[PDB]
Amino acid sequence: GSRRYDSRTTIFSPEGRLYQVEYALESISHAGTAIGIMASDGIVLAAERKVTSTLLEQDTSTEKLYKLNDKIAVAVAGLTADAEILINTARIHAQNYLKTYNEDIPVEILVRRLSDIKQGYTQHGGLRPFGVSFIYAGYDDRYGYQLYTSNPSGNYTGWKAISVGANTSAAQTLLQMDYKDDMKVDDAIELALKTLSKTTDSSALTYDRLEFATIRKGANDGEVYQKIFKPQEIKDILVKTGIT
Amino acid sequence: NNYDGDTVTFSPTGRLFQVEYALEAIKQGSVTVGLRSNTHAVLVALKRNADELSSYQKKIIKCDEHMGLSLAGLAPDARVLSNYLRQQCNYSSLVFNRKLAVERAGHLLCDKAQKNTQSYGGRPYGVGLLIIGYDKSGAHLLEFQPSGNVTELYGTAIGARSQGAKTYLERTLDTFIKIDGNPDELIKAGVEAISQSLRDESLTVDNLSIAIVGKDTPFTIYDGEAVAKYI
Amino acid sequence: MDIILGIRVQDSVILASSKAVTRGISVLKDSDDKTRQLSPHTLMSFAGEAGDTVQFAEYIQANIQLYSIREDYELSPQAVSSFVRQELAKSIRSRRPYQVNVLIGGYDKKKNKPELYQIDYLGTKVELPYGAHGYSGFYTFSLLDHHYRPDMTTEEGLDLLKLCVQELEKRMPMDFKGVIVKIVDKDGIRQVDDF
Amino acid sequence: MTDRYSFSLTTFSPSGKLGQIDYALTAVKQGVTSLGIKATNGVVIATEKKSSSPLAMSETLSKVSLLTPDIGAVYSGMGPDYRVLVDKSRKVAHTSYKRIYGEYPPTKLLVSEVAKIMQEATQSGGVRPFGVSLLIAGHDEFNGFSLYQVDPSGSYFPWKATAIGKGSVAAKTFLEKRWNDELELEDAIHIALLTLKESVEGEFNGDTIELAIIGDENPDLLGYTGIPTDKGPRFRKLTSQEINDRLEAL
Amino acid sequence: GYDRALSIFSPDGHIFQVEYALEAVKRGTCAVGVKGKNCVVLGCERRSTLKLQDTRITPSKVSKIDSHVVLSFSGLNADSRILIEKARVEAQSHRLTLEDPVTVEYLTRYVAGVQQRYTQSGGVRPFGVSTLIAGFDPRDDEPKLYQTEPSGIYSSWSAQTIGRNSKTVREFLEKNYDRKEPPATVEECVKLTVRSLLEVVQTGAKNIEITVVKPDSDIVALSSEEINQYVTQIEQEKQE
Amino acid sequence: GYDRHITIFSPEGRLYQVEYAFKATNQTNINSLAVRGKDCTVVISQKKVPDKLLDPTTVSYIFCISRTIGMVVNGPIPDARNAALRAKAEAAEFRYKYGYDMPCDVLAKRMANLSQIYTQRAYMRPLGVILTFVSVDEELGPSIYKTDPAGYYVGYKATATGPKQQEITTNLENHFKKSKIDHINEESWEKVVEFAITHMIDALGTEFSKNDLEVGVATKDKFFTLSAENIEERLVAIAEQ
Amino acid sequence: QFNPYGDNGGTILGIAGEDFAVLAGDTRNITDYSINSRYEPKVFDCGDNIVMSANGFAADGDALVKRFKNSVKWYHFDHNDKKLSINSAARNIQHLLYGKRFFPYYVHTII
Amino acid sequence: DRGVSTFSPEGRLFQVEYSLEAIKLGSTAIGIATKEGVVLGVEKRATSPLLESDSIEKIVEIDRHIGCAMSGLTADARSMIEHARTAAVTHNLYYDEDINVESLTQSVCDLALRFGELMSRPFGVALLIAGHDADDGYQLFHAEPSGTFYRYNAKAIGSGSEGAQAELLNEWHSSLTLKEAELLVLKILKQVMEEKLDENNAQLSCITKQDGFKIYDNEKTAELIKELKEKEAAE
Amino acid sequence: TGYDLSNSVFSPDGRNFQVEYAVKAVENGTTSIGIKCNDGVVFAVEKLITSKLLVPQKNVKIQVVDRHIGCVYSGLIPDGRHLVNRGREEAASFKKLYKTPIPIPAFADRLGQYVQAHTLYNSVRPFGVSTIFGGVDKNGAHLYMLEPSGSYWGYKGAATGKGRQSAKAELEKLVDHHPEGLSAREAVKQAAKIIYLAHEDNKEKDFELEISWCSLSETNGLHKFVKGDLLQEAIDFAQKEIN
User: Fold this and answer.
1) Superfamily assignment of I1-243 in CATH?
2) Is-catalytic flag, I30?
3) N or C: which end of chain D has fewer CB within 10 A?
4) Is D125 in contact with E2 (Cβ distance < 8 A)?
5) CATH homologous superfamily for the domain C1-195
6) Is F115 within 8 Å of chain D by CB?
7) Mind giving me the DSSP string for B130-163?
8) Residues spanned by the domain of F169
């Protein structure tokens, strides 16, 4: 019968690793670098696009940064199509929580359920895992500003600053060097771009190869606003920190 | 060789190896003999123990008052098939108030076994069966094999070294076929036939199993002290 | 079942619930506690169809206790109340609905406010200064409309409650064998033992 | 009987490639060239109708398909995979959008649905990926005109202009030279016609070229009158004649 | 559904997927539990290739199952979340029907059963996780510590350890734990637990976690300071 | 290379099972040809009866799918009959659901989509057949639509299928080059059948008796197949010419 | 409206001695005011020295007795020809009947 | 690879045969049948001195008149015990009687071959099922993952078995008293056990008609171990 | 390669090797034939007498479907039974819905489509039988032969199994020497001869003849077995012709 053609996506190696998870991570490591940095007064997400052609419609585009609800966003590294499947799940899961409890979903709870979905694909059902890693940036009134990452294994951890995709070893070293706890959001923005600027496999960072988003308390008192930077706004922030 | 991974595969010469390997567990099974006159049908089976401290595996199972079988091979597979037969004899009574013809019992077993020889992920039955009964057309003996092939016989034997008993009966044919109205003579001829298949061992009292069914005798099993009479 | 009341004063929520359990022409019990603690600062009283009431209250209690352990955190009363409403709103269109009315009294620690939610078996939720289920409301709402004040102390709330229980013992056809009273405040849930 | 193939047929190799997506893209590479150009007041999509035999009637074979009255698609790769995708795409515009909101979906969202279908063939049990890349051109009220490419992985990207298939590397280069943000629709048609001649060997005329636009609303193509606010489809397939007219002035 | 028998026997009578799951446990960070005379302690290594961690929000390694029972583990983290969730649901379900919280033996037997089921069901791989489960039966003061592993076998331990270099620390515990005389106090027991981890750990910086369980739902985490004290006190005594 | 056993892509983006299913198409060694008249559509196919023990009347690769649609298959008969039965079912259901006779091209599309699925879903093999559907559509007039194991389909002015198909094809292209039109400009279907047989003879360089052929004709509101005797009548008329 | 029950009359009677027991019943079967049969036995030997009658609606009675007889048959098959004791038969019959608690066998049963 | 329900060319089920290997690796279990009872005994085999050996539960009650000892992958046995208990209690509910030992055993063995592509693999544990019933008296059954069960006057399973079985072959006679049999199980366990037999790494149990199935406390077994040395020293 | 290890996989030739391997199992079986006659059809088969012990006459191999259809087959016997069981369900259903008994061509496609279905997936094995079958319907007599691939045609005469070519040769003579028709009683005799002639290719073991027929005039369009005086008369006729 059909056993002959079954890759057995959910088995252990003799060393006790999940091949398909390892290979998925290997896939992700060639994806555009995405960085999250957490400040005391907000969170930055920055991500680099897979080498743009000049004819790409840059402003009506969303490859790397997605809004989950009003208080939570994610940066994507890996297969985009795989990521959208998981994003709609997350978007719905946030809406059920609101509908049930009349309170926006705590960031960790949303992250756990997405990570639990990923885990399932590594233990049962014989399907390939999702080739995606997320950086979650969000706010809630229990823990305030939070950064998380999850990867195809279904493991998730929290961070002050972190990167995913290409050259994370390089980038993690640079973030470790210049990050400090008391840091404000505009310091974090600067750090995020300077880090991508040094780790990029391109000749130099331009606005047309970037996506950028903040989650500040930057509107009117004890309330949280999500900003997905328009192309022009990135170009300006690239000048204001003298990268171009 | 490359064609024996599962039942759903034919070899280049048109054989079904998993079925043939299933047939092979029968050959490893302890010997059992069946034979009949026109008035009774008899099963004799040599039972096997694990060692001197163990019981001797039952080889004969009653199916209805007028039907039963002996087994050689995988015992649980006999339990499954004999159970299926009990149900079919039962269905026939409750619905039609009719005793199940031994011929139809054969066809039903054949078709049950066959399903397992044409679909993925199952496996053939690993047991051979000798079915005796007395129905509306007299005494019958049947030989079931897990290929699905069922055969009506005057007498036969299956299991290890069944070939001796099988030739003996083939010689004795015109003698035993006419042991009518005599239970104990047909049994003796049964016991004699099984003896042509013994080696380094003869029939003891907790070693030998006989079953008889016929004109005015319900299918009944003899073990223990009530076989001594025949050694 | 029958009598369940709640009053929310300045710093606490008070639940009063009748002690009688009646089947036919027999009062089977006169000391029944028609309440479950859902979390250390949330309490739920219940009245309605025999069997359904306890089965529902315990089912809710189990889910809220599960949530508390999973998140190592206590849901707000507003959140617990919305969870409960949804369950009843599901139930009303089930094959056999839960016929249970509840009051949820809680102290929200993030807000430092007491809260009282009245929810009927249809899943009809309202937050109220005082609430009642069943015939009780026909006497107590107008009484409370008169005597209640928003800034009352827990002691003043208990007296306001005595007034309600006095009226109900005077005018209600059935002997409900008094009430068990429970206060929910910043320090959790405690039971008054003399009423 | 039934599907005992409930496991993935596309899996990660040790390098992290997804073989079957890679190989499907290779099939798209072999496929006949198609392209799309976005103007300020419209979009154009075009391809070659490379006929299998001259005894075939190639008008009966539509490579450019209406999806909604304001959205069109074209492809490169395996024709039959395209046909069923169009079928599924038209249906999903209704079931998961129009039957809910009483209006046709905006382009990015219908595209998003198609992409979802294609992603699922990349991960579900018992299937290979689709062997096509789509260019979807469309208009909607709040987003204007747009153009999207969808690949076998289910990834999609918006384009000012692009090409896919056989001679796409050359065609993309041609389009970079010629594309500007002030193109009027007739200019983009003319550029599409130039770009396509490169990658076409044989006859090049109205019967061998398939070309459709997302432009102005066409009341004459609606089918009825009397509802002022219903103005007609923006999708229009150019006729054999209309193409030849523009080739004289080529 | 996906059916394939992934956990099957091999000619030597080994179930390789169960055995490879054990490998995944061996690669996991170390966990140890030691039971006092009137308490149980759970200690856990935290692998120290990671700074820029946010420890406010990163999943702690010891989980509460009910208010009187805790579970720690070594192996795949994502797998462990599944066991913990199921264990928590069963804990509440046991209260709802039996009107009593679970015994530690019961909760262990449940989790062990889940693990075993995944070793003989179609379409699923075994849990790459072994657990230590510890606490106090309700209205009982005698402490409990159990260990489960991917095969589904479980048993009780005076003290025990799992994960990477657990053989080193099991060695330590075997020469330093008197059955006759269990760590008579909280202080005493936490110390033996920290020592055993120090054989294997590194610095006892943010590299050790300790959780103490006393009877009647008395469970508390220790903070860096208080562990650090134990670290500094044992190293000074060591200079001999 | 298990990528050669099921319908998954090969490294050069190919489906070998689909390709090998095309090779099964010619397993029967029959050629078929279809043309359009003014009023009709004619399909002819070689009929080869090797074994003398066969009942020659039961040997057929032409099928009456509906009252209006005929179908000729090039390929092994089991797969052919499997396709024929399905198409008959699909044509009947269409009538019931939508209240008009299923058009040739739509049935073609529908069978093409069914074939496409077997190229994408692993548990189904493709059918080793090519299906030529013919009718006089009530909107489109005389029609030929053909389907292959890849799930491809298109309409034809005329077509041919089988091992010697290319000869017949170029023969036909040459005729239409000369004729300058889309069809056989003939009044009766009888003379279109004559054209069909004649041009098959030139291209194949063989002569036919009445039992070497098999003819199906579609007119407005019926498709029918000719008896040996109707064909003989037709052969005779060509000979006296 | 279709009524799935009927009343076939008859009466049955069981008495137990020290070392014997009797089970008696009339042989008349009726519906309404008609006699269906003057001899239609409704007390049966069921094997293992158990006699049984299921009086009331004969269809249900014959279904029950048929099923119990079958139960005795399978008890032998599954428990090495063991004799079914009267107390065990009683309990078995409880389950037979209660299995149709929400669409009962309309019979009064004596063994 | 190859299906889980594949026959070998010798006519055996690969997966069943391989499970038999796993059982040989298991700790020793011994049962002896007398006219005064059946004794079941096991080697606990703690993998480390730190593990509390009384938590090793390899002898198990099924009903009051039926007990069970196991050897092999012992986690595989939880559900077989669960099935057995349910079957026994259920039988009593339907029939107001005790369920026969053979019937019980047959019920458990029906589980065994319900694996394939139903569970995914055979059980990796053998069982000694011991009990009493009125019709057949004291009984011992060896239930294997092949779905076959054999009755035995005495039997050994697990690692020490071929040694121990040869020992039981000589020592068993149809007049053993219960005490004689308890000693015998202790004797044979000490012979085949790696470590030195004592009351913490072996366990005894019996089932008598009068008192049903009892697991012996460590104090009781200790005195039988002391009693065993005294009888051996004195010849 | 490895194209031949899994049913429904096309080889690069265009062949399904597993079906072809099933044919080998058919060719390995005993011989069976069918002869179409004027108003009916005749079926016969060779039954190898493995042993003295086989009760003669009592292992019947020809099977009836409905009341008017006979089926006989060579190869794996249980596979043939499975096929007839399905044929029986198909004919029951046809008669249930349409009242009339199933016409023979209709019945042939029912088996054809079912057999062909077992060449479409790798999760089933093709049938290990060629099946000769037929009967009388409102349009006359029909004889059919059906192969593991699901291929079938109508036949003037047909044979399959080990003696298939010997019997074909013999059948070709008949068709040639009786162009105007063969009677039912004649065809029964011929059937016996041809089975005896085709027993040359299988002659270690000796055999038992079994015949059956449907004739509009001789059996009233119903399928009957040939027994007693008529069987013996045909056995005799065959005995003559081999000496």
Assistant:
1) Aminohydrolase, N-terminal nucleophile (Ntn) domain (3.60.20.10)
2) yes
3) C
4) yes
5) Aminohydrolase, N-terminal nucleophile (Ntn) domain (3.60.20.10)
6) yes
7) EEEEEETTEEEEEEE-TTS-EEEESEEEESTTHH
8) 1-241
